[PDB]
Design an enzyme around this catalytic site. Structure first.
Site, short mmCIF file in Angstrom:
data_model
loop_
_atom_site.label_atom_id
_atom_site.label_comp_id
_atom_site.label_asym_id
_atom_site.label_seq_id
_atom_site.Cartn_x
_atom_site.Cartn_y
_atom_site.Cartn_z
N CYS A 1 56.54 21.67 82.99
CA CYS A 1 56.49 22.21 81.67
C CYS A 1 57.84 22.86 81.05
O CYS A 1 58.14 24.27 81.38
CB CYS A 1 55.88 22.31 80.88
SG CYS A 1 55.84 22.89 79.29
N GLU B 1 50.38 15.33 83.24
CA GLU B 1 51.45 14.69 83.75
C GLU B 1 52.43 13.21 83.67
O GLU B 1 51.48 12.79 83.81
CB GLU B 1 51.49 15.18 85.27
CG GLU B 1 54.00 14.86 85.70
CD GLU B 1 54.02 13.82 85.82
OE1 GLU B 1 53.25 13.19 86.65
OE2 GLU B 1 55.31 12.95 85.45
N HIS B 2 53.21 12.62 83.14
CA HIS B 2 53.43 11.05 82.67
C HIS B 2 54.62 10.72 83.34
O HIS B 2 55.33 11.78 83.02
CB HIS B 2 53.07 10.85 81.74
CG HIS B 2 53.07 11.85 80.16
ND1 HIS B 2 54.64 11.40 80.41
CD2 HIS B 2 53.68 13.18 79.86
CE1 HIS B 2 55.51 12.70 79.33
NE2 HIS B 2 54.11 13.17 79.38
N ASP B 3 54.09 9.37 83.99
CA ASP B 3 55.59 8.81 84.08
C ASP B 3 56.51 9.12 82.00
O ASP B 3 56.39 9.45 81.12
CB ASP B 3 55.44 7.57 84.10
CG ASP B 3 54.35 7.27 85.78
OD1 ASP B 3 54.95 8.05 86.76
OD2 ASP B 3 53.68 6.13 85.45
N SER C 1 59.32 11.07 81.67
CA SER C 1 59.75 12.21 80.71
C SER C 1 60.86 12.31 80.52
O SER C 1 62.08 11.80 80.81
CB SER C 1 58.88 13.37 81.87
OG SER C 1 57.67 13.22 82.45
N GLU D 1 54.70 15.80 72.83
CA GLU D 1 55.91 16.70 72.95
C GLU D 1 57.38 16.39 73.06
O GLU D 1 57.26 17.31 72.56
CB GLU D 1 56.42 15.92 74.56
CG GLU D 1 54.94 16.59 76.00
CD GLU D 1 54.05 16.32 77.10
OE1 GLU D 1 55.62 14.85 77.47
OE2 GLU D 1 54.28 15.85 77.72
C1 HEM Z 1 49.06 25.53 77.72
C2 HEM Z 1 50.44 25.09 77.07
C3 HEM Z 1 50.87 23.91 77.94
C4 HEM Z 1 50.89 22.99 78.95
C5 HEM Z 1 49.06 23.05 80.04
C6 HEM Z 1 51.83 22.07 78.54
C7 HEM Z 1 51.57 21.51 80.04
C8 HEM Z 1 52.69 20.47 79.94
C9 HEM Z 1 52.86 19.35 81.81
C10 HEM Z 1 51.79 18.75 82.15
C11 HEM Z 1 54.43 18.29 81.37
C12 HEM Z 1 54.45 17.00 82.06
C13 HEM Z 1 53.91 16.06 81.51
C14 HEM Z 1 55.48 14.84 81.66
O1 HEM Z 1 56.79 14.70 81.21
O2 HEM Z 1 55.14 14.56 82.64
C15 HEM Z 1 55.13 18.97 79.80
C16 HEM Z 1 55.80 18.78 79.79
C17 HEM Z 1 56.59 18.98 78.33
N1 HEM Z 1 55.93 19.76 77.17
FE1 HEM Z 1 54.32 21.46 77.72
N2 HEM Z 1 52.71 22.18 77.63
C18 HEM Z 1 52.45 23.40 76.52
C19 HEM Z 1 52.69 23.92 75.76
C20 HEM Z 1 54.78 23.24 75.54
C21 HEM Z 1 55.11 23.96 74.34
C22 HEM Z 1 54.23 24.69 72.97
C23 HEM Z 1 55.87 22.89 74.21
C24 HEM Z 1 56.92 23.59 73.20
C25 HEM Z 1 56.53 23.57 71.71
C26 HEM Z 1 56.00 22.18 75.71
C27 HEM Z 1 57.11 21.36 75.78
C28 HEM Z 1 57.07 20.42 76.39
C29 HEM Z 1 57.72 19.71 76.33
C30 HEM Z 1 59.31 19.03 75.71
C31 HEM Z 1 57.35 18.76 77.67
C32 HEM Z 1 57.88 17.08 77.90
C33 HEM Z 1 59.61 17.61 78.91
C34 HEM Z 1 60.00 16.30 79.50
O3 HEM Z 1 59.34 15.46 79.21
O4 HEM Z 1 60.39 16.19 80.38
N3 HEM Z 1 54.92 22.35 75.88
N4 HEM Z 1 54.11 20.04 79.50
MN MN Z 2 56.48 13.24 84.34
#
Ligand code: HEM
Ligand code: MN
Ligand SMILES: *[C@@H]1O[C@H](CO)[C@@H](O[C@@H]2O[C@H](CO)[C@@H](O[C@@H]3O[C@H](CO)[C@@H](O)[C@H](O)[C@@H]3O)[C@H](O)[C@H]2NC(C)=O)[C@H](O)[C@H]1NC(C)=O
Ligand SMILES: *[C@@H]1O[C@H](CO)[C@@H](O[C@@H]2O[C@H](CO)[C@@H](O)[C@H](O)[C@H]2NC(C)=O)[C@H](O)[C@H]1NC(C)=O
Ligand SMILES: *[C@H]1O[C@H](CO)[C@@H](O)[C@H](O)[C@@H]1O[C@H]1O[C@H](CO)[C@@H](O)[C@H](O)[C@@H]1O
Ligand code: NAG
Ligand code: MAN
Ligand code: MAN
Ligand code: MAN
Ligand code: MAN
Ligand code: MAN
Ligand code: MAN
Ligand code: MAN
Ligand code: MAN
Ligand code: MAN
Ligand code: MAN
EC number: 1.11.1.10
Length: 299
Positions: free
Chosen positions: A30, A105-107, A109, A184
């Site tokens: 993330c 986490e997922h495919d 991204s 996301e």
């Molecule tokens: C406790 C809070 C959070 C947790 C545990 C968390 C966890 C994660 C995880 C596990 C992923 C990987 C998913 C993947 O892309 O395969 C991810 C991706 C992402 N997260 Fe977080 N997240 C949290 C909060 C946030 C917040 C508040 C934001 C923005 C405001 C954010 C923005 C993103 C974005 C944009 C991705 C996609 C990255 C990509 O696809 O390359 N996350 N998050």
């Molecule tokens: Mn992923």
């Protein structure tokens, strides 16, 4: 940034500087958690993190209200229990475990490779956790030559990523994850849509330079005029944005999309894992940090 710099003022009156993660520090898949950890708003080592620590970090330093991360906290701790084999209470063991595949986490991204992307053999796996410039460029190119993008553009980006992942991943691995990805998508609009435009709340446009800075640097684009949204973004904005992305008309259809790619997505819900299910091994790569250029404390 350095607290005396005033760079966050008057939106964040208590900033801490960027510090690059070291080889033993834990980082997440993330870009938000990584930015927070790089600033020590959550532990710089990425270990032993409570819900309240996450809530305060997001609210006070990113303009993201508690509502936005409610489900994310639930799922983080579900995944912690699944990966570690025991309840993690209110201390998330580390950030790295969040890159457990086919879970939170997922495919497909926007900026990470898939766990079995491009692997020659079925047991192989790769770094599905650290920022990957090539992968992110496949997202950016969908909006090449632009400074901003809208809900329809985001829909085209996620379709491109789905198409690429479905073609490149080891046969049978690719698993569509529209609900989680598009929360996301909503997160991206929530953090880096251009609030300097008069109709931002109704019709948000992502600033591409902001997005690129946040993802590439895993720090905050203050130098580009960004600041934490004020008032803090709430969950309603996020799921509305999510629904708008998936509702947007597709004017360019990539080939090799999975079944039902185009159209609305299910509501994201709490994850659950069978006790019989052993977790996939986590990629062990050292945490990524920006090196072209390396970042200073105020970057
Ligand atoms: C406790 C809070 C959070 C947790 C545990 C968390 C966890 C994660 C995880 C596990 C992923 C990987 C998913 C993947 O892309 O395969 C991810 C991706 C992402 N997260 Fe977080 N997240 C949290 C909060 C946030 C917040 C508040 C934001 C923005 C405001 C954010 C923005 C993103 C974005 C944009 C991705 C996609 C990255 C990509 O696809 O390359 N996350 N998050
Ligand atoms: Mn992923
Ligand atoms: C973040 O925490 C996770 C979860 O604890 C860490 O992943 C786990 O790391 C341990 C090593 O500390 C691995 O245990 C080893 O497993 C092998 C094979 O099962 C076994 O032969 C060894 O004796 C040892 O028990 C464990 O496999 C691994 N869990 C998974 C699902 O990969 C991770 O290293 C932590 N990361 C950071 C950077 O702190
Ligand atoms: C990652 O951060 C660095 C450091 O802030 C960016 O490079 C700087 O960009 C700022 C504007 O944001 C300029 O004022 C500086 O002249 C640049 N400094 C250096 C050392 O190059 C870099 O652009 C960021 N990366 C992305 C992709 O946004
Ligand atoms: C992670 O570390 C494991 C051993 O601790 C290796 O078996 C994995 O292949 C993986 O290695 C990758 O990341 C490490 C950092 O721990 C590098 O030292 C390796 O060169 C590799 O990139
Ligand atoms: C930052 O401090 C200024 C001056 O005291 C104040 O007006 C503003 O409300 C503060 N910002 C926050 C988010 O507390
Ligand atoms: C986004 O979607 C959720 C339901 O998933 C709503 O509760 C929210 O108001 C927004 O429309
Ligand atoms: C839900 O909220 C989003 C962001 O405010 C809007 O863009 C959408 O049209 C719906 O009202
Ligand atoms: C979810 O919400 C979005 C934003 O209002 C709609 O465009 C979509 O049709 C769905 O109801
Ligand atoms: C059709 O129009 C949409 C509108 O945003 C684009 O995203 C797409 O690239 C195609 O030109
Ligand atoms: C590409 O093709 C798909 C299916 O043929 C359409 O749903 C989309 O609108 C675009 O024309
Ligand atoms: C329209 O856009 C889609 C998604 O970016 C591509 O797959 C297609 O080649 C066309 O350029
Ligand atoms: C974002 O949120 C919307 C509304 O809940 C979903 O329809 C979408 O699949 C993604 O989870
Ligand atoms: C959540 O759901 C799974 C089944 O998908 C169970 O195995 C788990 O114990 C929990 O009820
Ligand atoms: C977890 O580990 C078991 C064996 O202990 C495997 O069978 C399973 O596929 C998963 O990797
Ligand atoms: C980022 O960090 C490196 C040292 O690791 C410097 O060479 C560079 O100028 C920037 O401060």
């Amino acid at each position: 940034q350095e607290p005396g710099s005033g760079i966050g003022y008057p939106y964040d009156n208590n900033t801490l500087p960027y510090v690059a993660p070291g080889p033993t520090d834990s980082r997440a898949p993330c870009p938000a958690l990584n930015a927070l950890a790089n600033h020590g708003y959550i532990p710089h080592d990425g270990r032993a993190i409570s819900r309240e620590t996450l809530q305060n970090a997001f609210l006070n330093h990113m303009g993201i209200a508690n509502s936005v991360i409610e489900l994310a906290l639930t799922n983080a701790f579900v995944v912690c229990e699944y990966v570690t084999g025991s309840d993690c209470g209110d201390s998330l063991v580390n950030l790295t475990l969040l890159a457990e595949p086919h879970a939170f986490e997922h495919d497909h991204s926007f900026s990470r490779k898939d766990y079995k992307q491009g692997v020659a053999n079925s047991n192989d796996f790769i770094d599905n956790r650290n920022f990957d410039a090539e992968t992110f460029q496949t997202s950016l190119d969908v909006v090449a030559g632009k400074t901003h993008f809208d809900y329809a553009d985001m829909n085209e980006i996620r379709l491109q990523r789905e198409s690429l992942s479905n073609e490149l991943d080891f046969p049978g691995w690719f698993t569509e994850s529209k609900p989680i990805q598009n929360v996301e998508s909503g997160f991206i609009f929530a953090l880096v849509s251009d609030f300097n435009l008069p109709d931002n709340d109704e019709n948000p446009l992502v600033r591409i330079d902001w997005w690129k800075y946040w993802f590439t640097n895993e720090s905050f684009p203050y130098h580009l005029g960004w600041h934490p949204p004020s008032p803090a973004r709430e969950i309603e904005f996020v799921t509305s944005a999510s629904s708008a992305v998936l509702a947007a008309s597709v004017t360019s259809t990539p080939s090799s999309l999975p079944s039902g790619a185009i159209g609305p997505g299910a509501e994201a819900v709490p994850l659950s894992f069978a006790s019989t299910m052993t977790p996939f091994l986590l990629a062990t790569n050292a945490p990524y940090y920006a090196q072209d250029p390396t970042l200073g404390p105020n970057d």
